[PDB]
Amino acid sequence: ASLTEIEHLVQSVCKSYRETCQLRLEDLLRQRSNIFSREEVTGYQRKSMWEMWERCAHHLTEAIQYVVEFAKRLSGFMELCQNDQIVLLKAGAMEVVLVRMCRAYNADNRTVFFEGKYGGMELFRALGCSELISSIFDFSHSLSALHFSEDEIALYTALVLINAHRPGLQEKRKVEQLQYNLELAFHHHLCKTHRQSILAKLPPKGKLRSLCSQHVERLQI
Numbered sequence: 001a002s003l004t005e006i007e008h009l010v011q012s013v014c015k016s017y018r019e020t021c022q023l024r025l026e027d028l029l030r031q032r033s034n035i036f037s038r039e040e041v042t043g044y045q046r047k048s049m050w051e052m053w054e055r056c057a058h059h060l061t062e063a064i065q066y067v068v069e070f071a072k073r074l075s076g077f078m079e080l081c082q083n084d085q086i087v088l089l090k091a092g093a094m095e096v097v098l099v100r101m102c103r104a105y106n107a108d109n110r111t112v113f114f115e116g117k118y119g120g121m122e123l124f125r126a127l128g129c130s131e132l133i134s135s136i137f138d139f140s141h142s143l144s145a146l147h148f149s150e151d152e153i154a155l156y157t158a159l160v161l162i163n164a165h166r167p168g169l170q171e172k173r174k175v176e177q178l179q180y181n182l183e184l185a186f187h188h189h190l191c192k193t194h195r196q197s198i199l200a201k202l203p204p205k206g207k208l209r210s211l212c213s214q215h216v217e218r219l220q221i
């Protein structure tokens with residue numbers, strides 16, 4: 001990787017993200033006026049926690065499937081050994097979904113796109129996860145404040161997944177090298193777009209894994 005090889009990695013990560021983003025950004029922004037009515041919100045609140053869990057678990061499964069496909073398109077990831085592909089997706093997929101959620105979040109009214117319309121955190125009252133759901137919305141709010149672009153999400157989430165510090169890697173030197181190349185690509189693309197500012201404004205990695213860890217615990221109770 002010299003400079004044109006750095007610039008090639010960027011466009012490839014940004015194309016792979018575009019092809020697996022699940023919902024187009026244009027349709028998320030256009031739908032910000034299609035908000036759940038007061039009556040539709042009550043309908044969600046009256047449902048059992050089990051019904052809301054089956055909905056959310058199946059939406060989380062569909063979101064994770066697109067995260068796997070984004071990785072399966074990453075130049076480098078597909079040459080790793082099967083155990084390494086698995087170890088990276090096991091530790092990183094849920095964090096990637098959390099970062100990805102910021103595109104579907106509207107900071108103007110603290111709502112998220114869910115099942116066809118925008119709804120506040122009150123929509124998920126039946127789960128009994130108000131504290132966890134508040135932190136999820138507050139993390140998405142801190143990423144939406146920065147106006148996180150599609151390509152920033154693409155490169156940033158590629159670094160969330162390609163991390164050599166994951167305990168269980170069989171070829172930790174290969175991941176470290178892919179991680180190193182993605183970092184040059186991310187830091188270079190911030191310079192090309194005059195966005196160097198967002199680095200110090202991004203959430204600390206510990207906050208992303210601590211939010212993810214709490215969410216993983218909720219997946220049982």
Ligand SMILES: CC(=O)N1CCC(C(=O)N2C[C@@H](c3ccc(C(O)(C(F)(F)F)C(F)(F)F)cc3)[C@@](C)(c3ccccc3)C2)CC1
Pocket residue numbers: 023052053056057059060063097098101104112113114115116124127129132133136215218219
């Ligand atoms: C129709 C459509 O395309 N949609 C866009 C995607 C959207 C979606 O998947 N959701 C699920 C939705 C969501 C809420 C809550 C959870 C939980 O894990 C649950 F146990 F209930 F399963 C919880 F423990 F946290 F409570 C998972 C997913 C959403 C707000 C969300 C997404 C990602 C991360 C955090 C929250 C939005 C569902 C609607």
